[PDB]
Write an enzyme that holds these catalytic residues in place. Sequence first.
Site, short mmCIF file in Angstrom:
data_model
loop_
_atom_site.label_atom_id
_atom_site.label_comp_id
_atom_site.label_asym_id
_atom_site.label_seq_id
_atom_site.Cartn_x
_atom_site.Cartn_y
_atom_site.Cartn_z
N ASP A 5 1.03 -0.82 0.02
CA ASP A 5 -0.36 0.03 0.20
C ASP A 5 0.70 1.21 -0.20
OD1 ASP A 5 -2.72 -0.86 -0.15
OD2 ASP A 5 -2.62 -1.47 1.75
N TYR B 8 -9.58 -0.06 2.53
CA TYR B 8 -9.81 -0.13 4.27
C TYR B 8 -9.07 1.69 4.73
C1 LIG Z 1 -9.38 16.55 -11.33
N1 LIG Z 1 -10.09 15.20 -10.54
C2 LIG Z 1 -8.89 14.47 -10.18
C3 LIG Z 1 -9.21 13.39 -11.59
N2 LIG Z 1 -10.39 12.63 -10.53
C4 LIG Z 1 -9.92 10.94 -10.71
C5 LIG Z 1 -11.25 10.56 -10.09
C6 LIG Z 1 -10.85 8.99 -10.30
C7 LIG Z 1 -9.63 8.69 -10.21
N3 LIG Z 1 -9.49 7.13 -10.57
C8 LIG Z 1 -8.75 6.56 -9.26
C9 LIG Z 1 -8.38 7.60 -8.59
C10 LIG Z 1 -7.65 7.10 -6.21
O1 LIG Z 1 -7.17 7.15 -6.34
N4 LIG Z 1 -7.74 5.10 -7.33
C11 LIG Z 1 -7.17 4.09 -6.01
C12 LIG Z 1 -6.65 4.90 -4.98
C13 LIG Z 1 -6.82 3.85 -4.15
C14 LIG Z 1 -5.32 2.30 -4.64
CL1 LIG Z 1 -4.62 2.41 -2.73
C15 LIG Z 1 -5.83 2.74 -5.56
C16 LIG Z 1 -6.63 2.88 -6.39
N5 LIG Z 1 -8.00 4.51 -8.12
C17 LIG Z 1 -8.75 5.21 -9.19
C18 LIG Z 1 -9.17 4.39 -10.32
N6 LIG Z 1 -8.91 3.00 -9.72
C19 LIG Z 1 -10.08 2.41 -10.28
N7 LIG Z 1 -10.24 3.12 -11.39
N8 LIG Z 1 -10.52 4.62 -11.01
C20 LIG Z 1 -9.21 8.70 -11.26
C21 LIG Z 1 -8.87 10.82 -11.45
C22 LIG Z 1 -11.30 12.88 -10.95
C23 LIG Z 1 -10.88 14.73 -11.04
#
Ligand SMILES: CN1CCN(c2ccc(Nc3cc(=O)n(-c4ccc(Cl)cc4)nc3-c3ncn[nH]3)cc2)CC1
EC number: 1.4.3.21
Lengths: 707, 711
Positions: free
Chosen positions: A330, A415
């Site tokens: 993580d 989590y």
């Molecule tokens: C200006 N904002 C920021 C970009 N945006 C956005 C929102 C969600 C995502 N997608 C993910 C963000 C993300 O932080 N995670 C993720 C978080 C914690 C962990 Cl441990 C692993 C991944 N995932 C995504 C995502 N995962 C699958 N699809 N999208 C990408 C961009 C919306 C508008």
Amino acid sequence: SQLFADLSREELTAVMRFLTQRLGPGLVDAAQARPSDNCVFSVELQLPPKAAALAHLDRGSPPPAREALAIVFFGRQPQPNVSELVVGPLPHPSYMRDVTVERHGGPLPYHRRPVLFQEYLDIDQMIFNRELPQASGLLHHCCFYKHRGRNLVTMTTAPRGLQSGDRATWFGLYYNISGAGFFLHHVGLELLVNHKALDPARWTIQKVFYQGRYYDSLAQLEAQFEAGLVNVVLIPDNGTGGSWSLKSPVPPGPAPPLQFYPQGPRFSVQGSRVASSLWTFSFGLGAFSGPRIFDVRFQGERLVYEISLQEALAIYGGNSPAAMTTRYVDGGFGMGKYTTPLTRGVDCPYLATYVDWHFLLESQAPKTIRDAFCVFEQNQGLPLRRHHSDLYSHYFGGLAETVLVVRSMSTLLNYDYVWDTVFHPSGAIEIRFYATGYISSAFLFGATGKYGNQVSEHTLGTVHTHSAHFKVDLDVAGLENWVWAEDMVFVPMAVPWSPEHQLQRLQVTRKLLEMEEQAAFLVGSATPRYLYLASNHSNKWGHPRGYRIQMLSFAGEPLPQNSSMARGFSWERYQLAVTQRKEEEPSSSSVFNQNDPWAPTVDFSDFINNETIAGKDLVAWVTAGFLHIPHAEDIPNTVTVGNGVGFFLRPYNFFDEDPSFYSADSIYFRGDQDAGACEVNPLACLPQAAACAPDLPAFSHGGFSHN
Amino acid sequence: HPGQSQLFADLSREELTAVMRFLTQRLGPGLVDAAQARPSDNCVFSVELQLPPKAAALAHLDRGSPPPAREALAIVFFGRQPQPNVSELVVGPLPHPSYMRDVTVERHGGPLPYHRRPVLFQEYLDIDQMIFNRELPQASGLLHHCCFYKHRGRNLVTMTTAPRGLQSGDRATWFGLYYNISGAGFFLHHVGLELLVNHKALDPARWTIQKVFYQGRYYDSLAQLEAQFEAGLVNVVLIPDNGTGGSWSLKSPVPPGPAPPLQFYPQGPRFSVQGSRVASSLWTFSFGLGAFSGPRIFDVRFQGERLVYEISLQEALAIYGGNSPAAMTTRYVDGGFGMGKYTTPLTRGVDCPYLATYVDWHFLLESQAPKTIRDAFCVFEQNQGLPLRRHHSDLYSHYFGGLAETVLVVRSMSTLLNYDYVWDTVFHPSGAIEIRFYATGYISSAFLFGATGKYGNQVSEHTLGTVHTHSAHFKVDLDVAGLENWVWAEDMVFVPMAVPWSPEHQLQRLQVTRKLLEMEEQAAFLVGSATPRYLYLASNHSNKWGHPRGYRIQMLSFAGEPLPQNSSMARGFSWERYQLAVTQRKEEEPSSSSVFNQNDPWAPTVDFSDFINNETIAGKDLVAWVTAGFLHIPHAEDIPNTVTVGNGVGFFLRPYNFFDEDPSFYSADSIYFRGDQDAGACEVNPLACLPQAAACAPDLPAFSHGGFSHN
Ligand SMILES: CN1CCN(c2ccc(Nc3cc(=O)n(-c4ccc(Cl)cc4)nc3-c3ncn[nH]3)cc2)CC1
Ligand SMILES: *[C@H]1O[C@H](CO)[C@@H](O[C@@H]2O[C@H](CO)[C@@H](O[C@@H]3O[C@H](CO[C@@H]4O[C@H](CO)[C@@H](O)[C@H](O)[C@@H]4O)[C@@H](O)[C@H](O[C@@H]4O[C@H](CO)[C@@H](O)[C@H](O)[C@@H]4O)[C@@H]3O)[C@H](O)[C@H]2NC(C)=O)[C@H](O)[C@H]1NC(C)=O
Ligand SMILES: CN1CCN(c2ccc(Nc3cc(=O)n(-c4ccc(Cl)cc4)nc3-c3ncn[nH]3)cc2)CC1
Ligand SMILES: *[C@@H]1O[C@H](CO)[C@@H](O[C@@H]2O[C@H](CO)[C@@H](O)[C@H](O)[C@H]2NC(C)=O)[C@H](O)[C@H]1NC(C)=O
Ligand SMILES: *[C@@H]1O[C@H](CO)[C@@H](O[C@H]2O[C@H](CO)[C@@H](O)[C@H](O)[C@H]2NC(C)=O)[C@H](O)[C@H]1NC(C)=O
Ligand SMILES: *C1O[C@H](CO)[C@@H](O)[C@H](O)[C@H]1NC(C)=O
Ligand SMILES: *[C@@H]1O[C@H](CO)[C@@H](O)[C@H](O)[C@H]1NC(C)=O
Ligand SMILES: *[C@@H]1O[C@H](CO)[C@@H](O)[C@H](O)[C@H]1NC(C)=O
Ligand SMILES: *[C@@H]1O[C@H](CO)[C@@H](O)[C@H](O)[C@H]1NC(C)=O
Ligand SMILES: *[C@@H]1O[C@H](CO)[C@@H](O)[C@H](O)[C@H]1NC(C)=O
Ligand SMILES: [Ca+2]
Ligand SMILES: [Ca+2]
Ligand SMILES: [Ca+2]
Ligand SMILES: [Ca+2]
Ligand SMILES: [Cu+2]
Ligand SMILES: [Cu+2]
């Protein structure tokens, strides 16, 4: 004038604009760059070296340069590269340095870069619009499709691929639940994706998984379904409570017990320094390593240079591929990065003092996560100590335990990890962490039961283990420390005064440890009972001034060494280890292991090596965790109870007598006083508790940054 | 007619004075107050609740039956006779008794040998008299010299060794000697004199001394010690008397500074206590205190359903090693003096939070006067400062859902000589139950002699902190959704495997491993043995999702090593040698110890191991037996007192597919709101209301303390 203080908005705005001008252009905002671009991933504090730091602190020396660490993605160029660059000095930056090489050895394979938001998003993008509509048919009968796939949504995994330099990530599909945990609503569909290519347009779907069978493409699946060969079964859109909600349906009760400081709070905080009657320290949050504190001083003497979270782990078993491959490191996403606001009154005592946090990650501008830490002082309804004598002399003396507390929480996908560090009146320190949030669920069918428990209708609670790593730089009585190991033993032995006629003779087993590998204990094999780091020095009665380590770990049985992935986090293999502290062994893990752990960017097992630990600057490495087979009562969230895991740092002939003895707040009397007399018993006082009670700060909330 | 009676309550004073009167009469020829009593005298030693059979109790509470005869149990010392025995007597039916029966052979299968009986207060004084009057006198010279001995007594003080003897039938205590400190612990100020007194005979006239030991040397008698000393031949060590700080005080020289955090319930308590029965929005139970066995709770119900019939301290241990004869041969079986008996008043605002609710406790021990112990128990609700659960969703949907963990607590403290043992019990809103026990108080200390350091550390001057282990046995009669329970052990395993979709490669397949334990010895785990991550007892019945309904036992030991089974003694605490056992619950398998084991563990009145005997534990009334403990190597920071932090030790009872969802989902104090909402709204968030409402904290009760000795 502190130097363990994370960077200010002004310091980041300051470093960024320095980078930007002096990297020509080619430069893109990380926020929305493609693989083929250059961009700044992270700008965060660069820790100082211990020498100069103490020199500065304990001997007036002017302070070592205040520097930052920029992680830069070098897409545009045919030798694409992730470079760690140091920038300095603050507050007005003027230099920059590719440490990359001298740190690791190579440069960084561009595929160890963790996935950008823009990347994650381009992946969803392809799935929702290129791929998924090829089974529009199945997904109608399966799970409410229409018209494109606004109803569904995806989740990352694991490492990404099967061998070094892959970038192949399994994703599940979950109903895009509105206002609850989507995590529980796995639709039964899993997609391996290949986003290794720098042109997203070159991205693939190497495999597909539905209801226990594998395919090579979506349309090949739909084909099969249409051929009538696949019993689709409709899988409920909505529902009632638990799975479906977090809102309690019951209304609110009488209010619950509340703590307040009747006359002022008895600690203070400015900057990242905390100051109490007994305790003193700096604190903060690495973007990836997360929580940490420094220069922890008790009654003014320093006990630890540093205690910091290193890394966190989650390893699954499973029905599906996604889960049975999945092992999260993580830290390779970031506990700093993914830290959340503390909801006053729920995460922390209502009256805690809550602090903000700043970062510039995947952006060009710094940002704040509000209420990111809380500090407070807490009564346990426990005595620290207490004696009541009705024998020979009539008297009582005791002292209730208040405690000082620093907390951050990091919400990672499903989590919520709770990080606790706890400062005791006895001079002890407790580090502790708790897993809450929601759980990771798969979809159900057949094999189940080797891999967990139906925790809901259709939902499988996938088995997993949590594990976590701490770097513990104790400087017991100054820097040179040794490591001791006392345990007990019985010895058969004739009784002196009458020997025939034997007696089991209890005895101590003290023993020193010179070498790194003696003081390095793997999961499975036993710790000695008492284990501590002593000094050259003696307390008054002639004992080496010690500080004991004492774990609270329930030992998630760890991934076989035998495995190719292993060395990406070989700290899981150890309960406790101790090491010669080096400026260039500053971490157990690193952000870049998540995506390529077959070729680990850091590999702990190296830190252990022949080397002596008779009288050096030591550092201890504590590993803590437990086995989590889910069950119904993790719905909706998993509770904290009996999920405490951590350890204790404990005085051990370090002092000459327990310092509580000199407490303001201890209490004493003998039968022959008036126990209810103000200047006899301070409790007999209190009477009036202010004009009226707590004056409570009107409740606010951090918000939802990216809000 | 849902049986609404009390029956796990310990006795009232009326109830006692009643029984006392009943017996007064029916024994007649030569009964005596025990507080005055001789060896050859007859004696009511104790009279306490005698608890019901379970059959009957349940019938009453569950199938609204008539409740069973409330009764009592009286321990009597028949010294005035040709073959003195101890006898255990039942007396009912309270409140107005009219019958009495002997159960001494019913229970034990012969009479009780009289030396098994505990040492009476009276005895202790006759002993102290022999010493301070017929012996130390003969070593006036030595003592004048070393130990300030002005012809008198209000000077030195004795304290008692563990088993008295070394073989069944002996009754010889090693006695340490120490300075009468006023206002602090004498335990530390040993003068290096220990005396092996033999007080078997029922004429204290006939009582003798069998050895001496002075500052590392053995001597055949006190005469023969002056013999030496005066003839210049003994090297004396001079061992002070006054001192300052730590060892000499218990009083902070620094003045009271600002007020510690304080806890109060902004609108009313949210539980109630009605004598033995506590009841809150979700938990409900009876509690009490055995005289020797100590604290106990009963009939624990979460939201109306019962999980446990009984949880109950069974015994406490302490095994010492050392340099001195005293210390090296001490194995204390603290139940043989009794953790009820030696309970002490909880000192309001120190031992529990100020606003807890404190509760008096009654008894009739070594007397004929019923006596009370004011504030023996406290009970309260506590804001833990955690959350029981949160989750913050920033991704896909904006929302927060959480709940701060407030918990319910019942406490007792038993100060036994040096030790102050704390016993908790804590009722978490998830339906979990935390047992938890600490040692503070002072240290049993020997006089320091050269070759230490495999017997402890140095702690004040002349003051060795002897090394010891700590055990504490518990009894857990889970009746998990019904009486019939089974035992399950689940754990994990990796199995290496070809990767299904690219079998070129190979993964380690993580896997679960359920195993049912049929027989008693399967579920009987020794100290330092391999030990099932998930272990729990379960019903035939099963939750909604199909898994059997279960309660998990989750331990917290750093457990000492056990006295070797080689030793002729471990007889008397076989329970020590187990992390945990499970066993068919029988009515004559009630305690795992007996007050009478302390003074004769070579012939143990109760040997816990007999309980494990090759029986099914599949689908029976099962009862679990947890042992908890740790090694104490004293050190300077145990001065003046040992400290709780990290010495806490116990176990967890956690639900495991017993429900269909986490019960706290429905809690009132639960909080939730979406990103699209205003969280500063009373109507969204209860916590928005805690400035306007929740102002005004209570005017507090003026401190009262419950006093000392016989109050
Ligand atoms: C200006 N904002 C920021 C970009 N945006 C956005 C929102 C969600 C995502 N997608 C993910 C963000 C993300 O932080 N995670 C993720 C978080 C914690 C962990 Cl441990 C692993 C991944 N995932 C995504 C995502 N995962 C699958 N699809 N999208 C990408 C961009 C919306 C508008
Ligand atoms: C991994 O990937 C990174 C990123 O590519 C590599 O580092 C970069 O690549 C070169 C080292 O191999 C470095 O090229 C440099 O180009 C600079 C040009 O402009 C700079 O201009 C500013 C003003 O705007 C000045 O202040 C600077 O002084 C520079 O002049 C020069 O510093 C320099 O010189 C020349 O480059 C030009 C093209 O610009 C050539 O045409 C010419 O023949 C000569 O080579 C310098 O060589 C670049 O600095 C470097 N960037 C950083 C931040 O390090 C890493 O080398 C890669 N890592 C590994 C291990 O391979
Ligand atoms: C109203 N009473 C009359 C009897 N009294 C009295 C006081 C002390 C004793 N002696 C002892 C009492 C006693 O309870 N204990 C003891 C305490 C805890 C544990 Cl576990 C074991 C014993 N000890 C003594 C005692 N030890 C050595 N000498 N006397 C005898 C009688 C004074 C007050
Ligand atoms: C233990 O002691 C009691 C009293 O000393 C014994 O009780 C007497 O027993 C005889 C015959 O068994 C009776 O006739 C007397 O009436 C009893 N007297 C009293 C005062 O109860 C008792 O029997 C002894 N127990 C054993 C097993 O020897
Ligand atoms: C999943 O559901 C949520 C719930 O609404 C979606 O987020 C929102 O939907 C509307 C359109 O985007 C907005 O106007 C709402 O304000 C917003 N809701 C919340 C609670 O923040 C979300 O976009 C949905 N699906 C996906 C794939 O993200
Ligand atoms: C105890 O022993 C056996 C196993 O040998 C067990 O199955 C049975 O219930 C007991 N013995 C007999 C003779 O039935
Ligand atoms: C470790 O060090 C010692 C001396 O420093 C050396 O003699 C020995 O061979 C080494 N042993 C191993 C196993 O590396
Ligand atoms: C010890 O000091 C106290 C003072 O409370 C006194 O009353 C007591 O009798 C003294 N000595 C002994 C042996 O009890
Ligand atoms: C010793 O006497 C008393 C305790 O009895 C102590 O308080 C005092 O301070 C001591 N002696 C001197 C010389 O001060
Ligand atoms: C459970 O217990 C036994 C099975 O051997 C049986 O008598 C009883 O009816 C069973 N009940 C259920 C619900 O399975
Ligand atoms: Ca090393
Ligand atoms: Ca160090
Ligand atoms: Ca049995
Ligand atoms: Ca049972
Ligand atoms: Cu988990
Ligand atoms: Cu102890």
